Structures are given as C-alpha cells and as structure tokens.
Amino acid sequence: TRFHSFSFYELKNVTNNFDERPISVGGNKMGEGGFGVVYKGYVNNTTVAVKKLAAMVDITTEELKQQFDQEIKVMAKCQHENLVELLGFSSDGDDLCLVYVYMPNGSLLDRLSCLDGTPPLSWHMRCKIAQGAANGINFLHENHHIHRDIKSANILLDEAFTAKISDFGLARASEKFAQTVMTSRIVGTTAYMAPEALRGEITPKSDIYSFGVVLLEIITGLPAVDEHREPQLLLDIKEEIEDEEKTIEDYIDKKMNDADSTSVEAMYSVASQCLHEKKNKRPDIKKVQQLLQEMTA
Numbered sequence: 001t002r003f004h005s006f007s008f009y010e011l012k013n014v015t016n017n018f019d020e021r022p023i024s025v026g027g028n029k030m031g032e033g034g035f036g037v038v039y040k041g042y043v044n045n046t047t048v049a050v051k052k053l054a055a056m057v058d059i060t061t062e063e064l065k066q067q068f069d070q071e072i073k074v075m076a077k078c079q080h081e082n083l084v085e086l087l088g089f090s091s092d093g094d095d096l097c098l099v100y101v102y103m104p105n106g107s108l109l110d111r112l113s114c115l116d117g118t119p120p121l122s123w124h125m126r127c128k129i130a131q132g133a134a135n136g137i138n139f140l141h142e143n144h145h146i147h148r149d150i151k152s153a154n155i156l157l158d159e160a161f162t163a164k165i166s167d168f169g170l171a172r173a174s175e176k177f178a179q180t181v182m183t184s185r186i187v188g189t190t191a192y193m194a195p196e197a198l199r200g201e202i203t204p205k206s207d208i209y210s211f212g213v214v215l216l217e218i219i220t221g222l223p224a225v226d227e228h229r230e231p232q233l234l235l236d237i238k239e240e241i242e243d244e245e246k247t248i249e250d251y252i253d254k255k256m257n258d259a260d261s262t263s264v265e266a267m268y269s270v271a272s273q274c275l276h277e278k279k280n281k282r283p284d285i286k287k288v289q290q291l292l293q294e295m296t297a
C-alpha cells in the first residue's frame with residue numbers, strides 16, 4: 001500500500017523500451033548488477049529510475065521474486081532522507097520492475113571513479129557523504145534490518161550529494177539486533193564481506209565491516225577489488241599500513257586539493273576499527289556515527 005502498481009507496458013513506454021545506450025549518449029541505461037539493469041524514465045513529468053530484475057548471475061526465478069518482495073517490504077517500513085524512495089513496481093507477466101525517485105548524481109562508486117567525466121569529489125563532500133551513509137545504516141539497524149550488501153555501488157547521491165542507501169533485496173530482520181543466525185545461502189559482494197558473513201553468519205556487525213571498505217574507497221578513490229592491482233583487495237592496505245610498509249598518506253586520492261592530514265587520519269581510524277577481523281571488536285553504527293561527526297568538529 002502507498003506504492004503505485006504499473007503495467008509492464010507503461011514502464012516499457014517510459015524507458016524508450018529499456019533503451020540500452022548510456023544516458024551520457026541519449027539512451028536510458030544508467031547501470032547494472034547481479035540482479036538487474038537500471039534505466040532512466042519520465043512518468044507524469046517525474047524523472048524515475050526503473051530497475052528491471054534479471055538473472056545476470058546464476059539465481060532462480062523464485063529467489064529473484066523473494067528479493068523483489070523483500071525490497072517492497074523494507075521500502076514500505078523504512079523512509080529516511082539517507083535511504084532511496086520506492087514509487088512503485090510492476091509484476092504482471094514474466095518481468096519484475098521497481099520504480100524509484102531518480103538520483104541525479106548516480107552512485108558513489110561512479111563519482112569516485114569520475115565515470116563520464118564528472119569532476120572529482122572534494123574531501124569536504126566525501127566527509128558529508130560518509131556521515132549521510134552512516135545515518136542511513138543507523139536508521140536500518142534502529143529498525144532491526146541487516147542490509148547484507150553495503151558497498152559504494154549501493155550508496156546513491158542526489159542533486160546536493162546527499163547519500164542514500166539502496167538495494168534491500170538481501171535485507172534480513174534481526175530479532176532485537178543482538179542474536180546472530182546462520183544461513184545456507186551466502187550472499188553479498190566478496191570484496192566487501194566480513195569473514196563471518198563469508199561463513200554464512202547474518203549479523204549487523206557485517207554491515208559495519210563493509211562500511212569500513214567504503215570508507216577506504218572514499219579516502220583512496222580506489223575500487224574495493226582490481227585484478228590488475230597489488231594488492232587486488234583494497235582491504236589489504238589496512239595490513240600494509242599496520243605493518244608500517246605504507247602510510248594512509250601513500251594511498252590518499254590525488255584528485256582532491258582540500259584533504260587535511262587530521263580529518264583523513266580520523267576517517268582512516270574509523271575505517272580501521274570497522275575492519276576488525278573479530279566482529280565483537282567492531283564499533284556499532286551509533287559509535288561510527290559519533291566518530292564521523294567528531295571528524296568534522
């Protein structure tokens with residue numbers, strides 16, 4: 001209730017038949033992941049994002065349908081300025097679509113890579129984005145949800161670079177947040193996942209680890225995994241710095257002119273604490289929030 005039920009044919013119309021050319025070149029395609037492709041549309045003068053779900057990795061039709069249903073359930077329960085907003089969906093015929101308010105600055109991942117020639121994010125803007133993302137995760141944890149896929153591709157940016165958490169298809173309710181459960185279907189993005197999540201545990205503490213990797217992407221402007229890089233995994237720079245083979249200053253994004261040592265070391269210190277290999281030693285999201293607020297004094 002509150003979401004609009006669209007026919008598939010209407011969404012076909014407003015995306016120019018899911019036009020696959022990039023938006024940068026006059027098409028409708030904005031991005032994609034393991035569970036679908038996101039297209040730009042216009043519905044009744046409103047710019048929208050339309051995610052058409054697909055098995056882009058190996059996933060059953062039934063699992064896809066459960067992710068669709070979970071997205072709608074979380075978005076029905078959770079409204080917050082640091083979460084994306086669902087307008088509607090379509091489930092008639094074979095295809096599943098979710099329709100959202102459009103995010104004019106795309107994904108934090110794309111902005112950190114300056115995809116399509118966008119200017120590099122200032123350190124000032126990076127600090128505000130880290131704070132907003134932590135406020136969104138805090139709202140989810142306060143509402144007894146575990147996200148399970150926190151990463152820079154799932155943190156979107158509006159016209160004022162307000163951070164919005166997206167993609168609740170893998171989210172799980174936690175019984176009063178305290179109690180860890182096991183699953184036999186291990187999901188998430190390997191380069192972001194806590195060790196316990198890679199073993200099948202489900203706990204909000206795994207969201208904190210993944211957020212640590214996002215903070216390193218913000219500091220460095222490097223992707224979480226790059227097969228043509230040493231180290232391949234960004235989280236391994238933590239070990240390089242701990243074993244004084246390197247310093248955070250060796251990894252700071254060069255595409256900024258406003259990064260002071262003090263606030264960069266403060267953000268690195270939050271990231272380092274989030275990336276504790278032992279889940280019980282990680283700060284909770286409320287502490288992460290406080291540390292990121294103290295960082296900008």
Ligand SMILES: CC(C)(O)c1cc2nn([C@H]3CC[C@H](CO)CC3)cc2cc1NC(=O)c1cccc(C(F)(F)F)n1
Pocket residue numbers: 023030031032038048049050051084085100101102103104105106107110116118156166167
């Ligand atoms: C798909 C992707 C990566 O997220 C996305 C990429 C974009 N690129 N741009 C360009 C950025 C560069 C600028 C040049 O100045 C012009 C526009 C706008 C975008 C908008 C996007 N997403 C959404 O609007 C959106 C909203 C809610 C829920 C979701 C969902 F869950 F489906 F991912 N997506």
Ligand SMILES: [Cl-]
Pocket residue numbers: 186187188189190
């Ligand atoms: Cl996985």
